[PDB]
């Protein structure tokens, strides 16, 4: 918005401007281990307690 | 750095950006509001300004 002025100067023009922002991107990375034996026995079928 | 013949006085002017208070008693001034008019300032090649 703008105010009206009464002085000798030319009237103040109404102002609408364009504001452009940028979107940042963040990446997150976590490392985890699993030993080969931990992954192997999943395929085997256990019967004895 | 010897003293010259005669002494002097020096003058300056200083500004101060000050915050002020205003008091006005009730019913001090009578205001008459007109009715706003329109005029067409210029017919621009791109737009119209009033």
């Amino acid at each position: 918005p703008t105010i009206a002025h009464g002085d000798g100067r030319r009237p103040s023009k109404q102002r609408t401007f364009i504001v452009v922002k940028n979107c940042h991107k963040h990446h997150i990375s976590t490392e985890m281990e699993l030993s080969m034996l931990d992954l192997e026995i999943l395929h085997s079928i256990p019967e004895t307690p | 750095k010897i003293h010259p013949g005669v002494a002097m006085t020096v003058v300056r002017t200083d500004e101060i950006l000050s915050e002020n208070i205003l008091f006005s008693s009730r019913a001090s001034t009578s205001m008459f509001i007109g009715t706003p008019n329109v005029s067409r300032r210029e017919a621009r090649v791109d737009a119209v300004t009033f």
């Binding site: 002085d7 000798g8 100067r9 030319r10 | 005029s39 067409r40 300032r41 210029e42 017919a43």
Partner: protein
């Protein structure tokens, strides 16, 4: 394309002056700067022409041509409504000058400082301690006549110094004093002492005169030197049978068209430049007129 200017007065109207201002409607005055709101002192010509100050009229011309010109439209108790002169617009005009000059159709009008009389074209508003000074709009012939008289006086004043009083009475106030019209004669105000900034035009005049007098042709001098002695003419009433011997001394050599032609070319080229040093006034062209209303349509 549409310009309406309001000038606000701090003090009141003081009706004693409003009647004279109101019969002063529809006439020109130059204002200081183009804005919607104006100062009162910049409005008239009162800034450039102080009462105590000696008038220097070329300075008045210089001020007048620079400022924008406005048509007085309406006086109100606190307001001055004036539309201005857009360079590409047509509008009516109506005028009443106490030195009163009668107009013709399609006659260009020149704007000049009020050389004739201070009381005439100036109205004092002592309520604001100001004085509105209106400029003078005249037909172009009388305008250039009066300006020429002014410059010739500014010269001959510097000239007539330390000469017999018979120079003091005659040239100073026979031709440089009065301007004629159809059965009419108006005196002029004359600067008591020669004014500065006026001869600033005359320096350029002397420059052009040196350059031109270096390239004058020969055959014209022979024609005139023949026509003054052998024949009689009204334009040659000025020169009597006797010739100024200067022409005889320059004349001695023979003629050649090839010499005359290049001189004539450069003389023509230096004649187009004089119109800049001779105008010194915004010109308004007449489109229609009515003596029964004294309201023309200038342009």
């Amino acid at each position: 394309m549409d310009l309406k200017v309001v000038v606000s007065l701090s003090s009141r109207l003081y009706t004693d002056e409003i009647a004279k201002m109101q019969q002063r409607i529809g006439c020109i005055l130059p204002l200081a700067s183009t804005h919607g709101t104006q100062n009162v002192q910049g409005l008239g010509l009162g800034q450039v022409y102080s009462l105590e100050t000696v008038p220097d009229y070329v300075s008045m011309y210089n001020y007048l041509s620079d400022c924008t010109l406005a048509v007085l439209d309406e006086v109100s108790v606190d307001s001055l409504i004036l539309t201005k002169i857009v360079p590409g617009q047509t509008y009516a005009i109506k005028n009443k000058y106490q030195p009163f000059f009668q107009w013709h159709g399609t006659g260009s009008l020149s704007v000049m400082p009020p050389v004739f009389g201070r009381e005439h074209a100036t109205v004092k508003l002592e309520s604001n301690d100001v004085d509105i000074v209106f400029p003078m709009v005249l037909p172009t012939p009388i305008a250039e006549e009066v300006l020429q008289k002014i410059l010739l006086f500014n010269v001959y004043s510097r000239v007539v110094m330390q000469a017999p009083g018979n120079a003091d009475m005659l040239d100073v106030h026979m031709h440089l004093g009065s301007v004629s019209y159809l059965g009419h004669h108006y005196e002029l105000a004359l600067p008591e002492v020669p004014g500065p900034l006026g001869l600033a035009l005359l320096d350029n005049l002397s420059l052009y005169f040196c350059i031109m007098v270096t390239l004058l042709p020969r055959a014209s001098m022979r024609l005139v030197r023949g026509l003054i002695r052998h024949e009689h003419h009204d334009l040659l009433n000025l020169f009597q049978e006797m010739v100024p011997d200067e022409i005889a001394r320059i004349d001695l050599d023979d003629l050649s068209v090839a010499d005359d032609l290049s001189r004539m070319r450069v003389m023509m080229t230096y004649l187009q430049s004089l119109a800049s040093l001779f105008n010194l006034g915004p010109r308004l062209a007449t489109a229609a007129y009515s003596q029964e209303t004294l309201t023309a349509t200038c342009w």
